Design a protein around this nucleic acid. Structure first.
Ligand SMILES: [Mg+2]
Ligand SMILES: [Mg+2]
Ligand SMILES: [Mg+2]
Ligand SMILES: [Mg+2]
Ligand SMILES: [Mg+2]
Ligand SMILES: [Mg+2]
Ligand SMILES: [Mg+2]
Ligand SMILES: [Mg+2]
Ligand SMILES: [Mg+2]
Ligand SMILES: [Mg+2]
Ligand SMILES: [Mg+2]
Ligand SMILES: [Mg+2]
Ligand SMILES: [Mg+2]
Ligand SMILES: [Mg+2]
Ligand SMILES: [Mg+2]
Ligand SMILES: [Mg+2]
Ligand SMILES: [Mg+2]
Ligand SMILES: [Mg+2]
Ligand SMILES: [Mg+2]
Ligand SMILES: [Mg+2]
Ligand SMILES: [Mg+2]
Ligand SMILES: [Mg+2]
Ligand SMILES: [Mg+2]
Ligand SMILES: [Mg+2]
Ligand SMILES: [Mg+2]
Ligand SMILES: [Mg+2]
Ligand SMILES: [Mg+2]
Ligand SMILES: [Mg+2]
Ligand SMILES: [Mg+2]
Ligand SMILES: [Mg+2]
Ligand SMILES: [Mg+2]
Ligand SMILES: [Mg+2]
Ligand SMILES: [Mg+2]
Ligand SMILES: [Mg+2]
Ligand SMILES: [Mg+2]
Ligand SMILES: [Mg+2]
Ligand SMILES: [Mg+2]
Ligand SMILES: [Mg+2]
Ligand SMILES: [Mg+2]
Ligand SMILES: [Mg+2]
Ligand SMILES: [Mg+2]
Ligand SMILES: [Mg+2]
Ligand SMILES: [Mg+2]
Ligand SMILES: [Mg+2]
Ligand SMILES: [Mg+2]
Ligand SMILES: [Mg+2]
Ligand SMILES: [Mg+2]
Ligand SMILES: [Mg+2]
Ligand SMILES: [Mg+2]
Ligand SMILES: [Mg+2]
Ligand SMILES: [Mg+2]
Ligand SMILES: [Mg+2]
Ligand SMILES: [Mg+2]
Ligand SMILES: [Mg+2]
Ligand SMILES: [Mg+2]
Ligand SMILES: [Mg+2]
Ligand SMILES: [Mg+2]
Ligand SMILES: [Mg+2]
Ligand SMILES: [Mg+2]
Ligand SMILES: [Mg+2]
Ligand SMILES: [Mg+2]
Ligand SMILES: [Mg+2]
Ligand SMILES: [Mg+2]
Ligand SMILES: [Mg+2]
Ligand SMILES: [Mg+2]
Ligand SMILES: [Mg+2]
Ligand SMILES: [Mg+2]
Ligand SMILES: [Mg+2]
Ligand SMILES: [Mg+2]
Ligand SMILES: [Mg+2]
Ligand SMILES: [Mg+2]
Ligand SMILES: [Mg+2]
Ligand SMILES: [Mg+2]
Ligand SMILES: [Mg+2]
Ligand SMILES: [Mg+2]
Ligand SMILES: [Mg+2]
Ligand SMILES: [Mg+2]
Ligand SMILES: [Mg+2]
Ligand SMILES: [Mg+2]
Ligand SMILES: [Mg+2]
Ligand SMILES: [Mg+2]
Ligand SMILES: [Mg+2]
Ligand SMILES: [Mg+2]
Ligand SMILES: [Mg+2]
Ligand SMILES: [Mg+2]
Ligand SMILES: [Mg+2]
Ligand SMILES: [Mg+2]
Ligand SMILES: [Mg+2]
Ligand SMILES: [Mg+2]
Ligand SMILES: [Mg+2]
Ligand SMILES: [Mg+2]
Ligand SMILES: [Mg+2]
Ligand SMILES: [Mg+2]
Ligand SMILES: [Mg+2]
Ligand SMILES: [Mg+2]
Ligand SMILES: [Mg+2]
Ligand SMILES: [Mg+2]
Ligand SMILES: [Mg+2]
Ligand SMILES: [Mg+2]
Ligand SMILES: [Mg+2]
Ligand SMILES: [Mg+2]
Ligand SMILES: [Mg+2]
Ligand SMILES: [Mg+2]
Ligand SMILES: [Mg+2]
Ligand SMILES: [Mg+2]
Ligand SMILES: [Mg+2]
Ligand SMILES: [Mg+2]
Ligand SMILES: [Mg+2]
Ligand SMILES: [Mg+2]
Ligand SMILES: [Mg+2]
Ligand SMILES: [Mg+2]
Ligand SMILES: [Mg+2]
Ligand SMILES: [Mg+2]
Ligand SMILES: [Mg+2]
Ligand SMILES: [Mg+2]
Ligand SMILES: [Mg+2]
Ligand SMILES: [Mg+2]
Ligand SMILES: [Mg+2]
Ligand SMILES: [Mg+2]
Ligand SMILES: [Mg+2]
Ligand SMILES: [Mg+2]
Ligand SMILES: [Mg+2]
Ligand SMILES: [Mg+2]
Ligand SMILES: [Mg+2]
Ligand SMILES: [Mg+2]
Ligand SMILES: [Mg+2]
Ligand SMILES: [Mg+2]
Ligand SMILES: [Mg+2]
Ligand SMILES: [Mg+2]
Ligand SMILES: [Mg+2]
Ligand SMILES: [Mg+2]
Ligand SMILES: [Mg+2]
Ligand SMILES: [Mg+2]
Ligand SMILES: [Mg+2]
Ligand SMILES: [Mg+2]
Ligand SMILES: [Mg+2]
Ligand SMILES: [Mg+2]
Ligand SMILES: [Mg+2]
Ligand SMILES: [Mg+2]
Ligand SMILES: [Mg+2]
Ligand SMILES: [Mg+2]
Ligand SMILES: [Mg+2]
Ligand SMILES: [Mg+2]
Ligand SMILES: [Mg+2]
Ligand SMILES: [Mg+2]
Ligand SMILES: [Mg+2]
Ligand SMILES: [Mg+2]
Ligand SMILES: [Mg+2]
Ligand SMILES: [Mg+2]
Ligand SMILES: [Mg+2]
Ligand SMILES: [Mg+2]
Ligand SMILES: [Mg+2]
Ligand SMILES: [Mg+2]
Ligand SMILES: [Mg+2]
Ligand SMILES: [Mg+2]
Ligand SMILES: [Mg+2]
Ligand SMILES: [Mg+2]
Ligand SMILES: [Mg+2]
Ligand SMILES: [Mg+2]
Ligand SMILES: [Mg+2]
Ligand SMILES: [Mg+2]
Ligand SMILES: [Mg+2]
Ligand SMILES: [Mg+2]
Ligand SMILES: [Mg+2]
Ligand SMILES: [Mg+2]
Ligand SMILES: [Mg+2]
Ligand SMILES: [Mg+2]
Ligand SMILES: [Mg+2]
Ligand SMILES: [Mg+2]
Ligand SMILES: [Mg+2]
Ligand SMILES: [Mg+2]
Ligand SMILES: [Mg+2]
Ligand SMILES: [Mg+2]
Ligand SMILES: [Mg+2]
Ligand SMILES: [Mg+2]
Ligand SMILES: [Mg+2]
Ligand SMILES: [Mg+2]
Ligand SMILES: [Mg+2]
Ligand SMILES: [Mg+2]
Ligand SMILES: [Mg+2]
Ligand SMILES: [Mg+2]
Ligand SMILES: [Mg+2]
Ligand SMILES: [Mg+2]
Ligand SMILES: [Mg+2]
Ligand SMILES: [Mg+2]
Ligand SMILES: [Mg+2]
Lengths: 100, 146, 202, 63
RNA sequence: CGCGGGGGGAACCUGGGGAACUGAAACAUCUCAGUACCCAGAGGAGAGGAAAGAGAAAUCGACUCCCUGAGUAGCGGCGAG
RNA sequence: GAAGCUGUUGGGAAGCAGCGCCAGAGAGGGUGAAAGCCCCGUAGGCGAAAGGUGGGGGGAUAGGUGAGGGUACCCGAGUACCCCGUGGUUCGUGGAGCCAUGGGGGAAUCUGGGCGGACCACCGCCUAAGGCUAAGUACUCCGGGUGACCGAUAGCGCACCAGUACCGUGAGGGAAAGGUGAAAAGAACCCCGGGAGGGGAGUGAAAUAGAGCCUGAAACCGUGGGCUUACAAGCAGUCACGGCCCCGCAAGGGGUUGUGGCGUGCCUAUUGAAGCAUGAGCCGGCGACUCACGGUCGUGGGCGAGCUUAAGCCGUUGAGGC
RNA sequence: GGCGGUAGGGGAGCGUUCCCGAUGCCGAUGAAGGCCGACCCGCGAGGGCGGCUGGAGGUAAGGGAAGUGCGAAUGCCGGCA
RNA sequence: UGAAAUUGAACUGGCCGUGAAGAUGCGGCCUACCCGUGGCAGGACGAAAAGACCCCGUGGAGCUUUACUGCAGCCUGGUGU
């Protein structure tokens, strides 16, 4: 429980290190590790292939899990902290001034 | 005046002695260097030699005590009238204890040397001598009774 | 001494304190040691060779063995043995004589009075518990944040206000104590407070 | 914790108001069969001790 | 046929049994200590509890726990305790 | 559940600079380093259908509550009571009562019966031989909070897959063992090799961070370099001089050791040790005068014929007060 | 003018851990620790400075409290000889 | 392939002195280039085992008796059944 955090799968700004200011959508979020993948961090896995099945398996540069505290959600501006206003039924996150 | 330098006024050196060292109180530590310096020594206070202490002396303290024990009975404390004379008005067993002497020992006995105040003085017993000093200056009533 | 500046909407008036003529630094060192002693929580423990988890058996015979000579792993000369005169929980507190406690409080207040830092007031215009208010309020009062201020008042709201400030230490009238007095460079208090201070000693 | 008055001592010794230790005289309860008058008489008084004086003082204290 | 017991629980609790080292600078009374430990039982506690009480006040008013009373009163090979 | 963004150094800013913002919140934790305002929080406040708890508040039932006069029916039995043997109590047989009770004898029902330290009198206190009763008290398996507590030889025996491995027939004994890196980016591919393991390539700020991998000490083993040694006599040093090698304008200084003078290891124990008296292979880590109460003297203070409070109560949550 | 020194008495100091000082200051232009010096101050235990390592801590002045200094205990654990 | 006990550190010679009275280590003198391998057991008061003998400790334990005191057991009066 409570492992949950900032945004889910959507647009986000990177206030990290080697990718500060960068922007992208989050294509995965690993709560078990409190990190998310965007489109930013990319390292070279010279590795032949991960699992013995399939001959070729790639030098893939794929995106490295980014620590969830180095990414802020964003909407009609520069990404604000998340408030939560409950509607007349449910509840959804209003940014520092707008919806969604 | 800040928390710097309230420093203990130049004498309270908590400096206990450490005899685990190489120059101060070393090796043997404190005064020892011999034997029967191990756990501890017999007494001394009273015990020792292992001969007769001085418990050769003897109890003239007859009336040492019976079985049922103490025998309750009125205890008279003397308050010297010179100290009584200090304050004024009219002194009673309560006022006396209420202010320094007595302390519920209960039995008040003005006595002794000094100079009597012309005041009234209720008590449980007066010394022959006290009786007169105050006789020639003021009034003096006896105890309640029981 | 006597020259305490009071503060009010009617302007700056001035009082006359009965505060002691001289400050004994040692007394304050005695009173502060006492305060820091009682809050000391006894809680350090270690295990004697008795409370350690091992058994009694004699490790080995002690005669024609060539080995050293021993009883049981408990023995403090073993690694993983018992500890010697290591600490056990104990009450560090003691009863510093009352005369002394007061002398201190008086001399403390005084030391500040004689320094001019003491400042009684009543004019708390910034009411509703809201830092901003007390902030602006202290601005007028001559408290900006260049010096530490022990604020003392009955009104919990004034408390709430000053409370979160990193150069202020809130405190009720009865809370007055040398340590806190001495800590802060500047004493400032409510009249109702200064009164219940004189109540204790005046 | 809390020293115990050596009952055996107080039962035979008195501490003088100044700070001295008084005790009875030995040698008068038995050996007698015909000791001088001078003997028994001087054995009736009581005396003072010196250094052992300081030994017993410590065995009382609450007293 | 019906309700109940049985067994377990760190420590704590009550009851039935109950040591020796050691101390006394030997040792037997004495001490260690009704402790250690064994046994039965109680339970979130257990025991105790409304006076055939205390004890010297023509006074107090169940029981329990803390402070004090007090290292007192006493007990004691009047030793150690 | 308040409040920040820009620049700059950097592998990475939370740093430095600019300007600014919240605060009933500047407890604390995290984020590539050092963050009130990025994240998780914190202040303040909100919450339960279901289970548990719950006189605290509220309601009901059980139960309970008077005066006088007369009669003497009743008022706990192998009990009280005395004796023998003991235990409890401060009480060790002591003048030995009280409470308890194994053996023997053995009542009374208020004009009864117990007790106030042998006994007796007087005067008081109290009603035995049926039973129950909350709270205030003790403890910590368990959960939470906090530390002038520990930091992997410490701290629980166990930070780790420990009451394990292993030892014991068994009761039972009982270990060792924590750390790459911000991230796995954990080293494709080539090269020598059977493999292990290397060299290059590549990732990284860093690879003497490369995987029981942070730092990485000492004993111990080794390669290279400088000085020195095969006519020498020894607690291994020390004093002097000279040579050689290395620093430096210099004068000086550093390393080595040829000759000369001097010189009986450390500790312990002891009248006395280099001792052919004890201990120690060497290095690293663990290792011994404390604490509580009470005493006594000295000492720095407060008050002074006075001085001081205990348990506790209120207060606070590192506040004092009564 | 005194000043060899065991047992022992007295005095003054140095350093390790922790607390107040601290919402502070030092700190990646480099924390602790490690390695090194023929330098500086201290009679000394120590303290400082400088280069090399090391990669995140450190903690004045003035005080406070201790699990506070090891060469030996046929000491204990480990490593190596 | 590869141990062990031992080991203060060693740069570890003979005689006559000497010394705590049995010297590789002090004095004097004599002899001796450096390092091994095989072999011997005179010395290193050689290793091993905190001397079993002996004494000491107001240490322990097993054993004896007309040592002391106590208990079982047995015998015995009184009494209960
Ligand atoms: Mg989304
Ligand atoms: Mg490929
Ligand atoms: Mg944008
Ligand atoms: Mg020491
Ligand atoms: Mg000294
Ligand atoms: Mg000395
Ligand atoms: Mg010495
Ligand atoms: Mg010795
Ligand atoms: Mg002793
Ligand atoms: Mg006599
Ligand atoms: Mg008496
Ligand atoms: Mg007269
Ligand atoms: Mg004025
Ligand atoms: Mg003064
Ligand atoms: Mg165990
Ligand atoms: Mg055990
Ligand atoms: Mg044990
Ligand atoms: Mg045993
Ligand atoms: Mg032996
Ligand atoms: Mg050996
Ligand atoms: Mg041992
Ligand atoms: Mg033992
Ligand atoms: Mg161990
Ligand atoms: Mg262990
Ligand atoms: Mg331990
Ligand atoms: Mg002024
Ligand atoms: Mg200023
Ligand atoms: Mg006197
Ligand atoms: Mg006196
Ligand atoms: Mg005197
Ligand atoms: Mg006689
Ligand atoms: Mg006579
Ligand atoms: Mg007394
Ligand atoms: Mg039924
Ligand atoms: Mg049951
Ligand atoms: Mg049960
Ligand atoms: Mg019992
Ligand atoms: Mg029993
Ligand atoms: Mg015995
Ligand atoms: Mg004996
Ligand atoms: Mg007993
Ligand atoms: Mg019991
Ligand atoms: Mg049964
Ligand atoms: Mg049971
Ligand atoms: Mg109960
Ligand atoms: Mg009951
Ligand atoms: Mg009744
Ligand atoms: Mg927030
Ligand atoms: Mg900022
Ligand atoms: Mg620029
Ligand atoms: Mg710059
Ligand atoms: Mg850059
Ligand atoms: Mg930035
Ligand atoms: Mg800076
Ligand atoms: Mg705003
Ligand atoms: Mg916390
Ligand atoms: Mg900072
Ligand atoms: Mg932070
Ligand atoms: Mg809340
Ligand atoms: Mg509800
Ligand atoms: Mg409901
Ligand atoms: Mg209740
Ligand atoms: Mg009814
Ligand atoms: Mg009625
Ligand atoms: Mg009637
Ligand atoms: Mg009748
Ligand atoms: Mg019956
Ligand atoms: Mg019957
Ligand atoms: Mg009847
Ligand atoms: Mg019958
Ligand atoms: Mg009977
Ligand atoms: Mg009867
Ligand atoms: Mg009777
Ligand atoms: Mg009988
Ligand atoms: Mg008999
Ligand atoms: Mg009897
Ligand atoms: Mg019994
Ligand atoms: Mg008895
Ligand atoms: Mg007793
Ligand atoms: Mg007894
Ligand atoms: Mg008795
Ligand atoms: Mg009876
Ligand atoms: Mg009976
Ligand atoms: Mg009775
Ligand atoms: Mg009675
Ligand atoms: Mg009587
Ligand atoms: Mg009664
Ligand atoms: Mg009754
Ligand atoms: Mg009855
Ligand atoms: Mg009844
Ligand atoms: Mg009853
Ligand atoms: Mg009853
Ligand atoms: Mg009950
Ligand atoms: Mg409690
Ligand atoms: Mg806990
Ligand atoms: Mg906790
Ligand atoms: Mg905590
Ligand atoms: Mg801590
Ligand atoms: Mg370890
Ligand atoms: Mg461990
Ligand atoms: Mg470590
Ligand atoms: Mg280890
Ligand atoms: Mg545990
Ligand atoms: Mg566990
Ligand atoms: Mg396992
Ligand atoms: Mg485990
Ligand atoms: Mg484990
Ligand atoms: Mg394991
Ligand atoms: Mg295992
Ligand atoms: Mg086996
Ligand atoms: Mg087996
Ligand atoms: Mg081990
Ligand atoms: Mg492991
Ligand atoms: Mg991967
Ligand atoms: Mg490679
Ligand atoms: Mg190829
Ligand atoms: Mg090949
Ligand atoms: Mg190949
Ligand atoms: Mg490899
Ligand atoms: Mg390879
Ligand atoms: Mg390479
Ligand atoms: Mg690179
Ligand atoms: Mg860098
Ligand atoms: Mg590194
Ligand atoms: Mg390895
Ligand atoms: Mg690291
Ligand atoms: Mg070489
Ligand atoms: Mg060479
Ligand atoms: Mg060279
Ligand atoms: Mg060469
Ligand atoms: Mg030579
Ligand atoms: Mg030479
Ligand atoms: Mg050169
Ligand atoms: Mg140069
Ligand atoms: Mg020149
Ligand atoms: Mg050189
Ligand atoms: Mg000489
Ligand atoms: Mg010897
Ligand atoms: Mg000898
Ligand atoms: Mg000697
Ligand atoms: Mg030798
Ligand atoms: Mg020998
Ligand atoms: Mg030797
Ligand atoms: Mg010896
Ligand atoms: Mg030795
Ligand atoms: Mg040896
Ligand atoms: Mg060995
Ligand atoms: Mg060492
Ligand atoms: Mg004084
Ligand atoms: Mg409290
Ligand atoms: Mg001179
Ligand atoms: Mg000298
Ligand atoms: Mg000193
Ligand atoms: Mg800085
Ligand atoms: Mg620089
Ligand atoms: Mg440190
Ligand atoms: Mg540290
Ligand atoms: Mg340096
Ligand atoms: Mg400091
Ligand atoms: Mg220690
Ligand atoms: Mg030593
Ligand atoms: Mg050692
Ligand atoms: Mg070893
Ligand atoms: Mg070893
Ligand atoms: Mg070996
Ligand atoms: Mg040779
Ligand atoms: Mg020679
Ligand atoms: Mg030799
Ligand atoms: Mg010589
Ligand atoms: Mg020679
Ligand atoms: Mg050979
Ligand atoms: Mg060969
Ligand atoms: Mg031989
Ligand atoms: Mg042979
Ligand atoms: Mg030899
Ligand atoms: Mg031989
Ligand atoms: Mg021997
Ligand atoms: Mg004997
Ligand atoms: Mg014996
Ligand atoms: Mg025996
Ligand atoms: Mg016979
Ligand atoms: Mg016979
Ligand atoms: Mg008999
Ligand atoms: Mg019979
Ligand atoms: Mg018979
Ligand atoms: Mg018969």
């Amino acid at each position: 429980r409570v492992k949950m955090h900032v945004k889910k799968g959507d647009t986000v700004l990177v206030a990290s290190g080697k990718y500060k200011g960068r922007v992208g959508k989050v294509k995965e979020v690993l709560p078990k590790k409190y990190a998310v993948i965007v489109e930013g961090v990319n390292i070279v896995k010279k590795a032949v292939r991960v699992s013995p099945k399939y001959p070729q398996g790639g030098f893939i540069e794929k995106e490295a899990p980014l620590h969830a505290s180095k990414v802020r959600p964003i909407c009609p501006a520069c990404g604000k902290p998340t408030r939560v206003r409950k509607k007349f039924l449910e509840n959804g996150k209003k940014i520092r001034v707008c919806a969604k | 005046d800040l928390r710097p330098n309230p420093g203990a006024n130049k004498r309270r050196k908590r400096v206990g002695r450490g005899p685990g060292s190489g120059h101060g109180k070393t090796a043997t530590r404190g005064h020892k260097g011999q034997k029967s310096r191990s756990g501890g020594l017999k007494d001394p206070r009273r015990f020792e030699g292992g001969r007769s202490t001085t418990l050769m002396r003897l109890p003239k303290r007859g009336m040492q005590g019976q079985v049922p024990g103490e025998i309750k009975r009125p205890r008279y404390q003397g308050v010297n009238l010179k100290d009584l004379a200090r304050f004024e008005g009219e002194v009673t067993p309560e006022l006396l204890v209420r202010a320094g002497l007595l302390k519920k020992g209960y039995r008040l006995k003005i006595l002794g040397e000094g100079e009597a105040k012309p005041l009234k003085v209720v008590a449980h017993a007066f010394s022959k001598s006290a009786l007169e000093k105050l006789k020639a200056a003021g009034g003096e009533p006896v105890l309640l009774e029981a | 001494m006597y020259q305490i500046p009071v503060l009010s909407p009617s302007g700056r008036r001035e009082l006359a304190a009965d505060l002691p003529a001289e400050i004994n630094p040692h007394l304050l060192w005695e009173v502060v040691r006492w305060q820091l002693a009682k809050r000391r929580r006894g809680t350090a423990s270690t295990k004697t060779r008795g409370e350690v988890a091992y058994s009694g058996r004699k490790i080995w015979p002690q005669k024609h063995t060539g080995r050293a000579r021993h009883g049981d792993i408990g023995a403090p000369i073993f690694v993983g043995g018992g500890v010697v005169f290591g600490p056990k929980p104990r009450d560090y507190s003691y009863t510093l004589p009352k005369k002394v406690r007061k002398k201190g409080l008086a001399m403390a207040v005084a030391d500040r009075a004689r320094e001019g830092k003491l400042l009684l007031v009543e004019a708390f215009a910034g009411v509703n518990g809201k830092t901003k208010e007390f902030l602006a309020w202290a601005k007028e009062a001559g408290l900006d944040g260049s010096e530490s201020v022990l604020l003392v008042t009955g009104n919990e709201l004034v408390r709430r206000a000053a409370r979160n400030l990193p150069w202020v230490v809130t405190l009720a009238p009865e809370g007055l104590n040398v340590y806190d007095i001495v800590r802060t460079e500047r004493l400032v208090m409510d009249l109702d407070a200064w009164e219940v201070f004189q109540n204790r000693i005046g | 914790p809390k020293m115990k008055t050596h009952k055996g001592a107080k039962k035979r010794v008195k501490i003088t108001a100044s700070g001295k230790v008084v005790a009875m005289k030995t040698g008068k309860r038995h050996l007698n069969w015909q000791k001088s008058g001078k003997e028994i008489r001087q054995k009736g008084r009581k005396f003072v001790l010196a250094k052992p004086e300081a030994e017993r003082i410590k065995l009382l204290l609450p007293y």
